[PDB]
Symmetry: D2
Subunit: 423 residues, 4 copies
Amino acid sequence: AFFQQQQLPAAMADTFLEHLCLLDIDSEPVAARSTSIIATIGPASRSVERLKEMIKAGMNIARLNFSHGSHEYHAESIANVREAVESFAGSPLSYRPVAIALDTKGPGSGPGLSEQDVRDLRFGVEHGVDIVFASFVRKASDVAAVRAALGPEGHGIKIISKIENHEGVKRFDEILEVSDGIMVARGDLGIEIPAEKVFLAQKMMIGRCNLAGKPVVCATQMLESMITKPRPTRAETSDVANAVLDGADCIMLSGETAKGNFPVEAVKMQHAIAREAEAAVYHRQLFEELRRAAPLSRDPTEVTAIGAVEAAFKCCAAAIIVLTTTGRSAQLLSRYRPRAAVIAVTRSAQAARQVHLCRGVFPLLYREPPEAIWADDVDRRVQFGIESGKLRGFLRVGDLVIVVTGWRPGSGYTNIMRVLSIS
Amino acid sequence: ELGTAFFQQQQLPAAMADTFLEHLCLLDIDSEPVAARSTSIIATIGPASRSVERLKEMIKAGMNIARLNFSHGSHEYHAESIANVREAVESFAGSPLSYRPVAIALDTKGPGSGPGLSEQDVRDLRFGVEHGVDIVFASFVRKASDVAAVRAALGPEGHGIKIISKIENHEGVKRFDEILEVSDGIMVARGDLGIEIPAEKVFLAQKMMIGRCNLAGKPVVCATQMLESMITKPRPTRAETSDVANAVLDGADCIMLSGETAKGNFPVEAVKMQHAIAREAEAAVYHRQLFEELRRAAPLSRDPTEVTAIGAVEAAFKCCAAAIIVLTTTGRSAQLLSRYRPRAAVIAVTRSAQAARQVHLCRGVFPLLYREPPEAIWADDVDRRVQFGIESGKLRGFLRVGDLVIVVTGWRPGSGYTNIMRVLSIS
Amino acid sequence: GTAFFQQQQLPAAMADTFLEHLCLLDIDSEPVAARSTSIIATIGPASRSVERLKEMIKAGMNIARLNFSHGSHEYHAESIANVREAVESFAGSPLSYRPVAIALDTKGPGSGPGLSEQDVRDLRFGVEHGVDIVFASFVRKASDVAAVRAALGPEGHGIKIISKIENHEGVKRFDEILEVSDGIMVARGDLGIEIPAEKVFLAQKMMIGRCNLAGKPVVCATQMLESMITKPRPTRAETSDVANAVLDGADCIMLSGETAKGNFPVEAVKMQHAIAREAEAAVYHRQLFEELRRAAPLSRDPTEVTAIGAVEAAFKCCAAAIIVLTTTGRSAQLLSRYRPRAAVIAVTRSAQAARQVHLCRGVFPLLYREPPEAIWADDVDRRVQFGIESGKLRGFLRVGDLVIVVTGWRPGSGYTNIMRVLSIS
Amino acid sequence: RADVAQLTQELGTAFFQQQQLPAAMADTFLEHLCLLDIDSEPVAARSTSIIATIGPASRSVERLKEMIKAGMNIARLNFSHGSHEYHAESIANVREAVESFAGSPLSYRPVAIALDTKGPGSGPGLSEQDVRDLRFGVEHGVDIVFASFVRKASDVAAVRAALGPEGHGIKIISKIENHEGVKRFDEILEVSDGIMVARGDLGIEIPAEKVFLAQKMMIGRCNLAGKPVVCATQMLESMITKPRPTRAETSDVANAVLDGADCIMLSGETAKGNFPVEAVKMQHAIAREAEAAVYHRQLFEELRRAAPLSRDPTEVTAIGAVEAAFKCCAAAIIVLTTTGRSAQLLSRYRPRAAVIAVTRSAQAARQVHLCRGVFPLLYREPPEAIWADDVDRRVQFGIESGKLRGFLRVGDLVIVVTGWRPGSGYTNIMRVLSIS
Ligand SMILES: Nc1ccc(S(=O)(=O)N2CCN(S(=O)(=O)c3ccc(O)c(O)c3)CC2)c2nonc12
Ligand SMILES: Nc1ccc(S(=O)(=O)N2CCN(S(=O)(=O)c3ccc(O)c(O)c3)CC2)c2nonc12
Ligand SMILES: O=P(O)(O)OC[C@H]1O[C@](O)(COP(=O)(O)O)[C@@H](O)[C@@H]1O
Ligand SMILES: O=P(O)(O)OC[C@H]1O[C@](O)(COP(=O)(O)O)[C@@H](O)[C@@H]1O
Ligand SMILES: O=P(O)(O)OC[C@H]1O[C@](O)(COP(=O)(O)O)[C@@H](O)[C@@H]1O
Ligand SMILES: O=P(O)(O)OC[C@H]1O[C@](O)(COP(=O)(O)O)[C@@H](O)[C@@H]1O
Ligand SMILES: O=C([O-])C(=O)[O-]
Ligand SMILES: O=C([O-])C(=O)[O-]
Ligand SMILES: O=C([O-])C(=O)[O-]
Ligand SMILES: O=C([O-])C(=O)[O-]
Ligand SMILES: [K+]
Ligand SMILES: [K+]
Ligand SMILES: [K+]
Ligand SMILES: [K+]
Ligand SMILES: [Mg+2]
Ligand SMILES: [Mg+2]
Ligand SMILES: [Mg+2]
Ligand SMILES: [Mg+2]
């Protein structure tokens, strides 16, 4: 029965063509949904009660569109998101962190950092936002200007550059090099370049981000008809599935959740599609290609990450449990696209929110009392990942897990991979 | 010899990549498509696309197959649509070197619960035979006996009509192999399929059916809501353009328009948009792995047509051939070339007007209808048809003097004897 | 039938990986195909008798090597005459006649920088006696090949020059030597003295790989069956060396003292024949063809385009043979570079091309002697029927077999452009 | 270039010119052949073990010391010739030569002792002389038995039974010498510790032109099973009388290593020849050149694809450690082992990195020479009070011995493989350490 679920007959195929031939509508997804859902907050999704339903439906990142609304409006949206999120903190083994992302208005008619963006970026730092979706990035100096406007207090906010025009596509490599990730902003991109070429830019950018090991977001009109209708079109469900199959780390909802009549249903639909598409991923070729393309490295976190992903595939590990301070060790595991869930146990509330940008990373915020012996404290965090995993359905007694830790406290010392039997 | 500019167009840098990941990384929005669009466009005929003048614009925009939906309208209404299509098509027939055939496909109403065919389907299928339709899109096919029922209804005069089974429910998906075995091809009818099975599972059924049809070498059509928003808006959504591109990248032979052309406000623009997207997606196909996998999955064969087809496709890839010119009576030799997915256009020269319309079902097949009287010496008649394909290709932009073409012929007249592949330099 | 798929290592041929291919190799799976790696036998006191040369031709000798390091011009002219007499004794039956090439192996430059005066005299002797191939000793650079070419003069333009790589400089300047040569000989004897003995296998494997990539003949030579000079059976290392030279990709394998002076010249030829046949069936064509296709650049030459189409068609139907019409041997060489499992039966009117194509693996030359028919299409057809009748008599073909036929659109060399699928009746 | 660019800037272009690294990074096997370079020097320690047959030419203690220094890892006693008194003296001389370098782990080289049986002859099962010779082996503490003419699984069971309850630790390597042994190979391999391709008898029992097919098939199946395979007979035959081998002989040794053999053997070359030490030096020189020419890119991918999924943590850790070693070009994989099993599971994936096996078992240290790329280190210190400290001391012993022996250098990355509790069978940890 195990080998009939999660498209495992299609996963064992020797060619991609045979993999397609073996895809089965009756093979149910079992693994937890890996691709994060970004939902835009607006009039249709601002209330605390609505936000609680959206968190339960699968929203991982709340997007604030600073093209509309005042700072007072956005501060209220932030407070409502935090209130809805913290209402589930009473059960620490099932609490779900939710990131807050600020989407800038943009440079507009000018080719420089606007005065409104400088004010909005400062608002973001003061309100503790986790991510900035920087609009209309056309070159590396645009990313540097956003970074500078965040100042010294905003040093830890992730900058996701939105590629929205021909220049951004042509200067992609230099933009990606200085960004934390990319958003394929298809709305403006489809007006700036011929509509029939947007899919080439999406596929190229997803491929280059996967190669770089940096998050990529697919955005705009994914479930557009759901703004007024309860069910999406056949093109819309295929678009969501294909963004996941292309290699996108995150999928986004704009008007569907910000102003539409069915915000919760749009989140549920993206969750349902992503789960089905993730099981249909051809890991046999994907992992070998990512493994071949990632350069040789002498960084122990990089070396441990490939060893752990290889070990997970060998035993069909239910999960890879990793301890992380900044999220980096979890991101390096994520870049190889394991079928095994990457359960990231962290003390940092910000890192727990930010790792939603990386596909297959399930953040757990550790809030248990400390152990006096560091080695005992490490083991306790590892057991916490196992208990949360058991409660959430990721793990069962008898499962094998890969555990990734470091040799000394502090960030940057991951170097150990262990094979653990559950209970 | 070819120039550096040649290797920058039609995603040739991405085509040379050693891995699919590197192929994605090398896709370029500035690399322009050069080859003729190979995925056929099926447009549904209705009030918005019925007039002769509107049909002429749709033919110019790229419509290859006209679909008549027998769920609506009387036999008198459909006979008028057929006559208007034929009048618009024949208005360009004055130039045999330029003439574009257009197939006519009848889409049945369906069984609507009950064994065998409905009485309305028997009557509509008989109308199709009497009006010389090329294809039947058979609704709600659930098993092999449903196809046998459609085949029996095609009377004594309609055995040459192609039956494309529409898979619209869970049973059709589960009994897919037995349905494909007895059908000429398949339509992934996503509208009903999305109501019969969970909406989030339709993409798995589409990808599986396209894969199995590609492996079997049989035509597969992707249908319903591909450019839905274009029924009222002049431009499609980002999800819609991606859906068309991904149907082509999945391996679909045909793409379809329903309400977009039958009742919408922008029928010609919907055809133009599908044409524009398909051209871009076809150049982005990763032929290196696709050909290798079709080659590996296809079993060994002692059929000379099948053996010649793989030799010709391999030869076309070796020289970047502008085209593969094939002589065919039934369309079979062109279909066997098509199954290996050559980048080269397959120019099919035929004397059969029906085979010229029906080969639009096979991706990359460009039919040319040959109307010259037969030569007394067969070898001369073969050479005259080969030169007709070269001169049509020159007129239409496929070929230039100095280009290499692959020519596929047989050793004697009649269908079933294809066994020769020649490499010709265009003079 | 099921029996067909149990022979010629076909279960190992279908394997998805090289490791699974090794695991499926079967000592009970008998070789069926004709032996495709040519055997070069050195002529000497043990193999100069016309009657003994007839036995070596029957055992499988394809090329007779004359080592100009020993013997006078008078001695070598006698070797040539005895070889030709033994070869021509089978000309009375044209359907089974086997051409045999004559190769002149030069003495070398010695302490000198360029072509020695003895080499200039020996090369002129070769042209005057109509030799087919020159194995040029101690080639160190492209100018050494040009000097050999110049010494052959205007009448020796058709002689093939196979450069012997025998020292470190020849290995380092390999690419420039291969570019101007017709092929290469891995002359392991001198190479093993010039460079450390434990490195010779790297130079052999590299040179075979680069020659296979270039589509040019490569000969593996020296001490392949050395112990058979005095013993009737070779050592386990010797049989493995022959098998591995074939698996590496060598077009030809050579015998030196084993046939020139040993007590078992005919048996040494039979042993090389037996091993090569076994090794050729064990070749992993699935990866080999894929890699040769991938490494070969795009081409606008119709002979080259037809060749890959014909090899792909032959693999699709398990063709028993690819029958090709050739004047210079080039169309057969372009088929050979893709390493088809199907035998390449080359029909030619050129006696020299029939001898020279033995340098290309899997090419079986047939010398056609009939004067041209008035209708060119009938002349082409009579040659293809000759290839079929020769193949049927020799065991290559049976009724019901599929064959790929490669021809051109007009008479003369350089116009191959047609591939046809034929059923043997 | 982008997949090696940063590592090329760090380690330098000279690093990437040695050990056939340009041929190693080729995308196809054809390009790998084209890039093989006679000027690319081998850097890694020789990983294929050399088995040398002991006889009149190689029996003296002083000669055995030179053979150990030249590279002999396993001493073979051929029980087809000589009395029990002769063989006991050969064993004592081997042990004396081996123990003469025992003052430090930087000079110590464990050498296994293998007993090669006379065989069944015309009889169906185990002969009475074999029963007596096998009991002699147990009484004299031999590490391995090369069982002659194994034709079926019951033949190996009979050898195992003749070793008795005290010889359960002895490894049984079945010699495949005839057609029946080849046809019943799978059942023989299943119950054996490894296989010897005994080409001498095999070449008389089956056509000589078919021996290479049997050798290649058996090596491939042993590699797939993860069990040792020995290539034997006439590898450097002419070196019995000549100081240099023939071109066929050097190619045969190189090709046995490229086929996947764990061990290569010398018979008359060391037992009775005029150049026993030179024969060992020649096999050592060829094996190092051939090991660097192995195409690890496809070999690792295929071993990975053919190996089934596993829930054994030692097996799961082994593939993770080999993958980690390839990622950083690790100088070594240091593994703690009691029976040798954890080192054998690393060895089956054919890492380019040396597998340094730290053990307290003198027998396991001798027996791991059967597995390609395993370098045994015999740990002699008494156990620490705290088990975790004892483990750490053994790992540091491997690092310090590795540095002083040239295997490791400052700045190198090493992969360390250990378990979660004492005792055999609990390996489950892989660590990445930087050498300081
Ligand atoms: N890095 C990556 C590796 C592998 C994949 S993949 O999903 O396995 N991938 C699907 C597309 N191709 S294809 O050549 O177009 C093809 C399409 C259809 C066919 O029938 C066929 O035979 C080949 C095969 C490979 C990735 N997807 O995103 N990133 C990927
Ligand atoms: N288990 C094993 C796995 C992989 C290898 S390998 O070294 O990577 N390798 C061997 C040679 N072959 S080939 O198909 O004969 C070939 C030969 C020549 C060619 O030019 C070519 O393109 C292909 C390619 C694969 C092994 N070698 O011994 N055991 C091996
Ligand atoms: O992914 P990051 O940011 O490098 O964090 C990984 C770090 O987490 C740990 O596993 C545990 O460290 P702490 O005890 O400081 O939480 C370290 O050993 C390791 O260096
Ligand atoms: O694709 P089909 O229907 O088999 O037709 C291919 C046939 O066309 C030809 O090339 C030309 O035949 P005709 O002269 O009868 O048209 C035949 O030699 C070949 O058998
Ligand atoms: O291999 P080559 O030397 O190019 O010879 C091939 C030539 O042989 C032919 O098949 C037959 O030519 P001939 O009639 O002159 O012998 C030509 O059509 C073709 O050009
Ligand atoms: O390779 P083997 O025989 O399984 O030995 C591996 C064992 O060695 C260890 O690393 C150390 O164990 P000991 O302390 O008993 O020597 C164990 O944790 C592990 O189970
Ligand atoms: O701003 C956006 O998200 C866009 O343009 O797609
Ligand atoms: O009938 C159709 O085309 C459908 O249901 O999609
Ligand atoms: O000359 C030769 O043939 C040699 O040196 O091997
Ligand atoms: O016994 C042996 O070693 C042999 O026969 O090779
Ligand atoms: K915005
Ligand atoms: K209908
Ligand atoms: K000479
Ligand atoms: K013995
Ligand atoms: Mg925008
Ligand atoms: Mg329907
Ligand atoms: Mg020489
Ligand atoms: Mg023996």
